[PDB]
Amino acid sequence: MENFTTNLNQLARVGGIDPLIGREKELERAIQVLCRRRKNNPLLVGESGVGKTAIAEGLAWRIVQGDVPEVMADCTIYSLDIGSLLAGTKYRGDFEKRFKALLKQLEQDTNSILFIDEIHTIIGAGAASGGQVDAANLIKPLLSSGKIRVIGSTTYQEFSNIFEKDRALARRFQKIDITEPSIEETVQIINGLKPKYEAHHDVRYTAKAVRAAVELAVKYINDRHLPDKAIDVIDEAGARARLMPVSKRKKTVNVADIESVVARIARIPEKSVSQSDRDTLKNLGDRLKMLVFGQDKAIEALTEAIKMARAGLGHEHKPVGSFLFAGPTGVGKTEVTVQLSKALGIELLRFDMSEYMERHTVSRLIGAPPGYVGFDQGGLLTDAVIKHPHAVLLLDEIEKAHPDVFNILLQVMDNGTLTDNNGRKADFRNVVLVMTTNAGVRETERKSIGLIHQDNSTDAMEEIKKIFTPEFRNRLDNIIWFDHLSTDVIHQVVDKFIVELQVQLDQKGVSLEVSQEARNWLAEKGYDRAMGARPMARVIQDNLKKPLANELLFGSLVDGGQVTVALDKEKNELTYGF
Amino acid sequence: REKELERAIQVLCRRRKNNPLLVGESGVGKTAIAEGLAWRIVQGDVPEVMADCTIYSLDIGSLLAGTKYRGDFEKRFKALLKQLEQDTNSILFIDEIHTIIGAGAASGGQVDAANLIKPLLSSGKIRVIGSTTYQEFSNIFEKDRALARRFQKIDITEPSIEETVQIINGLKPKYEAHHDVRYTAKAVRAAVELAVKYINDRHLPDKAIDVIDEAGARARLMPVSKRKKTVNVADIESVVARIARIPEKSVSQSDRDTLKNLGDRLKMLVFGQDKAIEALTEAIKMARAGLGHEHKPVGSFLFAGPTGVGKTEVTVQLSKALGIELLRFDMSEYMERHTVSRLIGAPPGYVGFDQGGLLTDAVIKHPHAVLLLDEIEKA
Ligand SMILES: Nc1ncnc2c1ncn2[C@@H]1O[C@H](COP(=O)(O)OP(=O)(O)OP(=O)(O)O)[C@@H](O)[C@H]1O
Ligand SMILES: Nc1ncnc2c1ncn2[C@@H]1O[C@H](COP(=O)(O)OP(=O)(O)O)[C@@H](O)[C@H]1O
Ligand SMILES: Nc1ncnc2c1ncn2[C@@H]1O[C@H](COP(=O)(O)OP(=O)(O)O)[C@@H](O)[C@H]1O
Ligand SMILES: Nc1ncnc2c1ncn2[C@@H]1O[C@H](COP(=O)(O)OP(=O)(O)O)[C@@H](O)[C@H]1O
């Protein structure tokens, strides 16, 4: 074992092992497990950046320091990796002999403990040099009899793939749950390692830089457990400090240098790491009021709710917001969402719920079960958010979605996340969730009976309460009701449609002047509150696009030029030559 | 579990479909029985039917080790079966019978190991004792008639409280010797009595024992056994709690005062409706007092009131106050008949496959829970 197993206690004596910071209960469990007769081989099971190996080394350090009771103090912890014994590529003549030499020496020294990092290498695996399945089988009897003790190292997902599949370990080993350290501990961990970064990069880190690397990494980097996200910031700040300033050569890394690299590591703007866009948010309501007319309270409800989320009044785990838009048709409930994403400068992820009416929607939104085509997709919903965690997400006409989609949505509204079928998760915290419904368009066309008409409208949102259950409705920030639009709105709608018509005409080299009276008339001609703004697109198409198309194709407008439309005293559209 | 040993024997005594299979789940003691069958033989406590028969445990590890080539796994395995077939009244015990179904110990070894056994079972050359689980049985034996019709299904269940205490006392001296400790009568009963209250997801034979092992081991590791060799119920409480985190603070408090104090604790969180919370307290006491039947619910109460008045909050506080889970369902979502089946886990219209009932699962996972059904007039 002389050139095969690393003595961790010796590295701790040498100084190869950095003192463990915190983790007193994790170490206590490892020793509590090691001191037992059965299930007496601990497994440090976690995720990346938790330090599970650092803890195992940390235990060897405590064994050496004598911070544990003699049962374990002065025992020897050695570590086996995939570098020394896996060199037996000439097979068993090298491998079996070196492998068994360890077992025999370790069997003789019953106060010897091995640490096996990346333990999945052997458990649930066992190849390498073609020696590890039985090498594991040759360790197991000695762990059972108490001749050799073993500390493992794995992750929660690997654990279920390797431990839960082998009863030899179920009776020999015990899981210890390893999670991330505190913020303070992370800073202390950085300070322990800091000099290594300083030495590599020829930089020096301030006290504020190390505190900030941990704090800033938490605020924006969602990739790893605290030690790793903070370290990349320190290592990146260090490196940038020695690369960028060729003409300046600053060595000291301060909070400002952390802010620059965190922004880059975290995939956010160099400004936004500290300074958010206060003004795009202040101006949101007006930019939208200029595009979707008449829905002023709806825009304000949306605008204010977003600002509250952006102002930090809400929960750090939840979506930016969640709204179910409802109202009559042709009122802008989707148009405002589309314009919302543009106004905010945020990519729009759009899912049309009509495409998900079956109970197999999940197989496409989340992903197919393993063994089926499509298991490779992480889910259309989940993948879109993972690649675009900062997004406006639209679920168009949600009342048509199959009810199973609500289990997906209820989870996101409660926890801000959604896992895929491969164990990865979407982060919806920077996603604005808007879903629209036409349950609210149900109304009648029939009037009251009598000489005098009276308003016989039904109660708003009763139809929503009958479609969406309280579980789904109580998780919304709001339900934003859109009203039928008025004739004043129509005049504004006609103006934007005339402009759109002109944009199309500009591409033909044609300038169109529509008189005010022509607009006033069309606005009146096409109005129907029941169908919202739809009809206006239609009346404009019927009265202006028809004549223009005929001229653009066969007549005077074919070459580009100036066309105008006047309203007749007789309410006809009068057109110009060119 | 003497009848289990006898049942395996009655199967070994048959001429066809004469290979007993011990079918269990983790912690029931199915391995212990197989060990017990070998034990009875070594002590001569067997019928002549078995004569002086030797039960051997298939060692897939040893068959694979040092080679990992199909040719060597096979010459050793086939030689094994030949020698086992040759022994008079031979019995092959296969522990982990559900794991050799692949290739013995590993891919690269004998991929046909199950296939080499099938014909001996068919001829009855070696009586074979298997060891599988309830869940694996249908994926190992029912899977292939060459085994389904060669083995008998013997259902192994967990032992009683008293039997586990006897198991602890049987093994206790080993733990006392292993960890330089002694266990009180209360400690051995407590490892059993408390494991069944706080462990929840494992059978008693392993967990009362883990608790004994850990109390001993913990006392050896900490400077306790050096002086305080004795492990009493107090040490057991710390040990079960070590993982469960319950008994060290809640193994016993008062089964009378934690109920009386319910009336007043509810008043600290929910304000007003004092009589409603007292009525619940009274009903709970009557149930605790033993007024009712073993098949009946602890209790059932309809909470009528305005919304937003804490009907839920009282229910939440009852669950917290009583140390139990809260299960919730909204009856307005169970207004239609199909959804009703989803709730029940009725043979038709259930959830998923193993997700069957929503209510059946909720009541199985959390059997001591308080179940809240909202707005039942909409059900
Ligand atoms: N309030 C509005 N102001 C200006 N233009 C509008 C308004 N509503 C709609 N429009 C225009 O009419 C068209 C239809 O709008 P939109 O797609 O948003 O309807 P909707 O809210 O989705 O209702 P539904 O889905 O039931 O049809 C769009 O091209 C849009 O530009
Ligand atoms: N208690 C600790 N003391 C010092 N450093 C720690 C501690 N815990 C974690 N770390 C740091 O976390 C890293 C080790 O964990 P790591 O190897 O990244 O886990 P994983 O293998 O799952 O990715 C090291 O950078 C280590 O310094
Ligand atoms: N009937 C029994 N009598 C005594 N000890 C038992 C009994 N059954 C199980 N045990 C012990 O409880 C632990 C788990 O039993 P085990 O045979 O491994 O079942 P499983 O592997 O299915 O969980 C073991 O330590 C075992 O020795
Ligand atoms: N009796 C009560 N004591 C304290 N808070 C209450 C009480 N009743 C209602 N509330 C509060 O009113 C809100 C709704 O109460 P809750 O029971 O959770 O939902 P529901 O309206 O369905 O009963 C909550 O903020 C709750 O705290």
Tab-separated table of N, CA, C and O and ligand atoms in Angstrom, chain B residues 269-271 273 307-313, ligand 4:
chain	number	residue	atom	x	y	z
B	269	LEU	N	-52.450	31.080	19.291
B	269	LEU	CA	-52.204	31.269	17.883
B	269	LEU	C	-53.460	31.732	17.180
B	269	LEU	O	-53.417	32.627	16.339
B	270	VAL	N	-54.582	31.101	17.511
B	270	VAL	CA	-55.861	31.435	16.925
B	270	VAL	C	-56.623	32.194	17.954
B	270	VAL	O	-56.735	31.733	19.085
B	271	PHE	N	-57.112	33.356	17.596
B	271	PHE	CA	-57.759	34.139	18.607
B	271	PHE	C	-59.252	34.153	18.403
B	271	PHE	O	-59.752	34.241	17.279
B	273	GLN	N	-63.050	32.176	19.215
B	273	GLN	CA	-63.485	30.789	19.023
B	273	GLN	C	-62.911	29.868	20.088
B	273	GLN	O	-62.663	28.686	19.840
B	307	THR	N	-65.361	32.212	6.102
B	307	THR	CA	-63.993	31.875	5.701
B	307	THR	C	-63.092	32.855	6.379
B	307	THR	O	-63.551	33.819	6.981
B	308	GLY	N	-61.814	32.576	6.384
B	308	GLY	CA	-60.871	33.531	6.921
B	308	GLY	C	-60.980	33.658	8.434
B	308	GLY	O	-60.737	34.729	8.991
B	309	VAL	N	-61.399	32.608	9.122
B	309	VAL	CA	-61.552	32.724	10.556
B	309	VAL	C	-60.647	31.750	11.254
B	309	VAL	O	-60.874	31.407	12.410
B	310	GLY	N	-59.676	31.204	10.543
B	310	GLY	CA	-58.771	30.292	11.175
B	310	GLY	C	-59.269	28.853	11.248
B	310	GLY	O	-58.772	28.067	12.037
B	311	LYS	N	-60.237	28.438	10.434
B	311	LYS	CA	-60.635	27.031	10.574
B	311	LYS	C	-59.405	26.148	10.257
B	311	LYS	O	-59.165	25.107	10.905
B	312	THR	N	-58.646	26.572	9.250
B	312	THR	CA	-57.459	25.898	8.786
B	312	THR	C	-56.387	26.087	9.806
B	312	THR	O	-55.682	25.155	10.146
B	313	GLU	N	-56.287	27.300	10.338
B	313	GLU	CA	-55.217	27.592	11.267
B	313	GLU	C	-55.375	26.748	12.508
B	313	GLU	O	-54.385	26.243	13.018
C	4	LIG	N1	-58.593	32.323	13.720
C	4	LIG	C1	-57.436	32.961	13.074
C	4	LIG	N2	-56.317	33.211	13.766
C	4	LIG	C2	-55.261	33.791	13.178
C	4	LIG	N3	-55.275	34.140	11.900
C	4	LIG	C3	-56.366	33.922	11.127
C	4	LIG	C4	-57.478	33.319	11.713
C	4	LIG	N4	-58.404	33.215	10.769
C	4	LIG	C5	-57.920	33.718	9.646
C	4	LIG	N5	-56.685	34.146	9.860
C	4	LIG	C6	-55.844	34.747	8.894
C	4	LIG	O1	-56.649	35.098	7.634
C	4	LIG	C7	-55.792	34.541	6.412
C	4	LIG	C8	-56.468	33.321	5.806
C	4	LIG	O2	-56.525	32.291	6.805
C	4	LIG	P1	-56.436	30.706	6.316
C	4	LIG	O3	-57.088	29.809	7.374
C	4	LIG	O4	-54.975	30.310	6.141
C	4	LIG	O5	-57.229	30.531	4.885
C	4	LIG	P2	-58.862	30.476	4.749
C	4	LIG	O6	-59.385	31.854	4.356
C	4	LIG	O7	-59.242	29.468	3.686
C	4	LIG	O8	-59.474	30.062	6.086
C	4	LIG	C9	-54.610	34.199	6.926
C	4	LIG	O9	-53.693	35.300	6.825
C	4	LIG	C10	-54.891	33.853	8.479
C	4	LIG	O10	-53.708	34.020	9.235
